[PDB]
């Protein structure tokens, strides 16, 4: 009730002030050192906030909220934290004036709902303008985030990879994309020009013994290519009690020989009836185990993790056979083919498994000459896939980059005089808090934040109502509408809702209780 | 502020360690250990930096940057660290006097680095003189690479095609200027050399086979069969025919973009996807040609040889960078349709057509050709030198002063300070050699300021003398390698606003 | 340089916030204990800042601002300190954004000139020819004083005195010509204008003094009647030529300046002046030397040779009014065409505490009436002019450009401190009362009129002008050095 409200504002402001300079494409990077000794440098605020280990109870809400923001949007990492700090700074002045904290929390909710209806009138349509203009937004979606990196030279190649990947994994009914249906895999070595868009799981394999061919035979015009995965511990006859198997002398050579191999001869007949071309297991295989399957042209795969088996069954429509007796050919998956394609000069000799049909999952293939380039390309592609989902789910979009915050500011400030009572000042403080983002982008762009903010407000009133934002990166001129720079409306709408939800949870906690360390 | 001070004062203190070791007359440094009996003395700059343990997290970044120069080339490693340290001395004076994000200053270094590379090109010389002796050695080395390769059947025919594919380039040696066309059902001895850009899968049916003064434009759009996946979208219609009407209304808006294509003054349009008959029929009246199956690789290789650019959108009409080709010939060979582009303005390129008997012989011949051309083209940037002795170092200094004429208000000090760092090289060399840096550099800049200056740094007489008479030259590849490495090294430290202290071990 | 300015702003903000609690009659009074043991209690901001002995150099500027506040407008000495501290509190975040104080200082002067025209458009135009609003202005201003029923009797006395000396283009009128002579005895009901002049003391009470003379001349004489001071007939001979030279100019009124050096009039000279009926008034204060030289149009005369007839005034009738413990001498018909007639009113009362507070109460009443002389019209107080300005600056702030656009937003926020303090000192909720005033602003504008609470426009105008230059001069000093 006394020093708690003052300390929570200064504590949350000092933590949020770290990423204020990294907002935007011109935002400066940071050097993060992992406890294992690896140095990481990235502009994403999600990595910076996740690596923070601290006992401050106020800053813990930023880490828990940022985990859900990556799956829903992914671009609300730095933007929401900076916007949440603006609502706390405006609320600090109201505490000294005698304003109740819950009235400040309830005042931001009513002010946010009124600002959403204002942008609904000024938003523009994508599909109604043209069909091909929508695809042009997908090609330039990843260009903005990758424009500050060397990848910006080859960006035209990575633009077409996200167009076909989202359509397959997302249906127009629910218009949702699952994170578990996107396999992000990358390795060190090679270049970024060899990245290809694969419709199915990669599943790197050396084909065991080299005599096995690099391609799968159609098996007399059979339908697709059938695979068999086995998670069973396929292994010698280990009992539950005795074990203790040893060869006494040469006299036991022919005694134990014919007694063993005659077993598997029964189970191999059930596999040929189903037509499974390849066998996949979780653990390794023996040397002589794959030799008898070589004459039948039945390759085997070993050393496969448990998580990698998810993308194999979904993409290829395969399953894991419990028993070979009742196994039929109805539910066995069929793909186009399985071949081995060497990638660059790497001696690993990876392979490509295609489909040619629409699947429920995709696998992202990213390469690079440096370990940092690969990691920076994987995280930038994740945010690019979420923007495509927001454009399909909501056709109406608005122009961001400083143009949306100024429009929302003038709409709430104008309606503040029409709404009397205590909420009159709650709307004024909320409108001034929205001005922090365009001023932050102006400061991050190396320009006068106040001199630029006064310009954006003058062009949207005396001239005409339009969207003009602050340019962090050097461009030709203003009026981003001419450059066809679009931002998702539902993506920006999710940010302002989580910002008000985060600001309330901070003000609703007036007490800090923590034990000691022993 | 300590985040930048650790990357400036901390880096300069470490940078000044190997700064005095630049050159054969430079200083030396001892590396002492705890037991002191394991120590050693050396002049290597990269060894001193890596051996000394440093708890500064900003100093560890410079170590990883210096490893790139050793793996890529491996020459002038110390000069990269010394030049990168001088860039921090000028950048520190620009920040403290500004306190604005350095990313704007970084943009000034990119514009200044372009003028430095262009100034070294005009004054660059080469050992390529008497090409008759170099051409005889080029064909002999190529025959050695052909060993163990299926191309070893005839060495004379294959090495002759590679000889005219190098010396006739007169430009970049990248493989993007060499097109590889491979077909089946042919002999390797029938291979020929062509300077045109060759496609396959000829475009159009009623389109003419001869095009005069053709223009090239790069764009990405789908004019045929839109709305790939219609499943999942709620369809409320009174009749079935209204479903196809919506697709026609979306393609109707493309008429404005098609009308802008004819306003560009181009007779040919290139698209990756297909085109419906209605927008394709309008291309005949407007004289527009539709090229298909451009893929991606072939798009980039065509825009570079023709002087064009690639863009997937239209920013504004009558503004773009376009190429041209005089004559396009459409022929057919090997039971496959072929395309031929010729008559490009300043076109420099070549195409080697290899005829194999199977798919296995084609992949082995293409990979063996790139390895053979990479070794032969390596000598183009090798042995080529430029005039040294501080001359070329000062030429880059006066070239930046030209950019200082037309410059922005806040970008002037960023560009002007870059020229001061270029003049720090003769200052360091004069101090390590035992001379007066203020006396030599002052008289060196006044002479090279305007015109007719062959003078350079002479360490034997302790004065400014002509380096062309003494025969003091330095490699041109070393010039670009150090400048490009030091420019990227300074960006890594400036783009980081806050540096967290590393975990002490 | 900010270490010098920020240290002065924080030091001045603590002083302004301390005086802020003293605003209004219900405000919190501040106590100051001098090193000598004297303790004063009052809500006057000019008295607190004068006896506080502030060692901060910039904070001492508020004393000069409060002095000019009472000398020009006559009210708002506490409010001008609050407005000064309000701009300093909002200037803390201005320096953090990298704003140079020149734009901050130039915007305060430009906003002060535009704020005057906004108040004039909302103010009601009145004229001095109507005595209806002039009497009610001084009557309601005395509701803060012990006098209640007698306040209506002194209302027309202050109105008729100002309207005669106001004229039209005279604009500012010197307040030094108004002297209120207080004396124990009498009552408030007995008042005399006496436009000629009024002295501060009585006349000779000895035997032989006429104490009354008709058609006499009044003049300033610094001489003194004393015996020779480097036998009875020798001293009378020296005093004979003194009274003979005065008879040459026919001066029947002798005003001797009060001095502790020597005496005033010898007893032997009283018998000489009794035959000629020459009235003498001694114990003339040093402050009255300049006062008598203005309205009477006379000149101070140091020596006996400097005494001439041309420097003597004119008095129709000089008499001593008989009253209990008073004995006030009045002069009427000075007959001075060039100089305007002075206004001096005698204040009488039984208790000493009456004539004291009554003199101070009439000073504030004459200033409010004088505010209408320079600029006509009045604006009701209670936070009405402070909120009305912020209503017009809301849409005007969007029409600006650059750094100055943000200053107009913070300038209207600093003006809300004055109505907020008025609501706190009354016990009511600060924000709750301010929101109710802005809610009805869509219909009502100036509406307090039924409560007979009125304020002149010059107080609200001078409070903004003086506070604008004050804060402007604060940011001009970036360093403090010792110079002796």
Curated annotation (Swiss-Prot), chain A:
The keyword Amino-acid biosynthesis does not apply. It comes from the Eukaryota. GO terms for cellular component: chaperonin-containing T-complex. PROSITE patterns: TCP1_1 (PS00750), TCP1_3 (PS00995). The keyword Nucleotide-binding applies. SUPFAM superfamilies: GroEL apical domain-like (SSF52029), GroEL equatorial domain-like (SSF48592), GroEL-intermediate domain like (SSF54849). InterPro entries: Chap_CCT_epsi (IPR012718), Chaperone_TCP-1 (IPR017998), Chaperonin_TCP-1_CS (IPR002194), Cpn60/GroEL/TCP-1 (IPR002423), GroEL-like_apical_dom_sf (IPR027409), GROEL-like_equatorial_sf (IPR027413), TCP-1-like_intermed_sf (IPR027410), TCP-1_chaperonin (IPR053374). GO terms for molecular function: ATP binding; ATP hydrolysis activity; ATP-dependent protein folding chaperone; unfolded protein binding. Its main location: cytoplasm. It is found in: Cytoplasm. Keywords: ATP-binding, Chaperone, Cytoplasm, Nucleotide-binding. Pfam families: Cpn60_TCP1. GO terms for biological process: chaperone mediated protein folding independent of cofactor; protein folding. Molecular chaperone; assists the folding of proteins upon ATP hydrolysis. Known to play a role, in vitro, in the folding of actin and tubulin. In yeast may play a role in mitotic spindle formation. Belongs to the TCP-1 chaperonin family. Heterooligomeric complex of about 850 to 900 kDa that forms two stacked rings, 12 to 16 nm in diameter. PANTHER family: CHAPERONIN. This is T-complex protein 1 subunit epsilon.
Curated annotation (Swiss-Prot), chain B:
GO terms for biological process: chaperone mediated protein folding independent of cofactor; protein folding. CDD domains: TCP1_beta. One of its GO terms (cellular component) is cytoplasm. It holds the Pfam family Cpn60_TCP1. It is found in: Cytoplasm. InterPro entries: Chap_CCT_beta, Chaperone_TCP-1, Chaperonin_TCP-1_CS, Cpn60/GroEL/TCP-1, GroEL-like_apical_dom_sf, GROEL-like_equatorial_sf, TCP-1-like_intermed_sf. Keywords: Acetylation, ATP-binding, Chaperone, Cytoplasm, Nucleotide-binding. Its main location: cytoplasm. GO terms for molecular function: ATP binding; ATP hydrolysis activity; ATP-dependent protein folding chaperone; unfolded protein binding. SUPFAM superfamilies: GroEL apical domain-like, GroEL equatorial domain-like, GroEL-intermediate domain like. Heterooligomeric complex of about 850 to 900 kDa that forms two stacked rings, 12 to 16 nm in diameter. Interacts with PLP2; this interaction leads to inhibition of CCT complex mediated actin folding. PANTHER family: CHAPERONIN. Belongs to the TCP-1 chaperonin family. Molecular chaperone; assists the folding of proteins upon ATP hydrolysis. Known to play a role, in vitro, in the folding of actin and tubulin. In yeast may play a role in mitotic spindle formation. This is T-complex protein 1 subunit beta. It comes from Saccharomyces cerevisiae (strain ATCC 204508 / S288c). The gene is CCT2.
Swiss-Prot record, chain C:
GO terms for cellular component: chaperonin-containing T-complex. GO terms for molecular function: ATP binding; ATP hydrolysis activity; ATP-dependent protein folding chaperone; unfolded protein binding. The keyword Nuclease does not apply. Keywords: ATP-binding, Chaperone, Cytoplasm, Nucleotide-binding. It is found in: Cytoplasm. The keyword Mitochondrion does not apply. It holds the Pfam family Cpn60_TCP1. Belongs to the TCP-1 chaperonin family. Molecular chaperone; assists the folding of proteins upon ATP hydrolysis. Known to play a role, in vitro, in the folding of actin and tubulin. In yeast may play a role in mitotic spindle formation. Present with 5530 molecules/cell in log phase SD medium. Heterooligomeric complex of about 850 to 900 kDa that forms two stacked rings, 12 to 16 nm in diameter. PANTHER family: CHAPERONIN. This is T-complex protein 1 subunit delta.
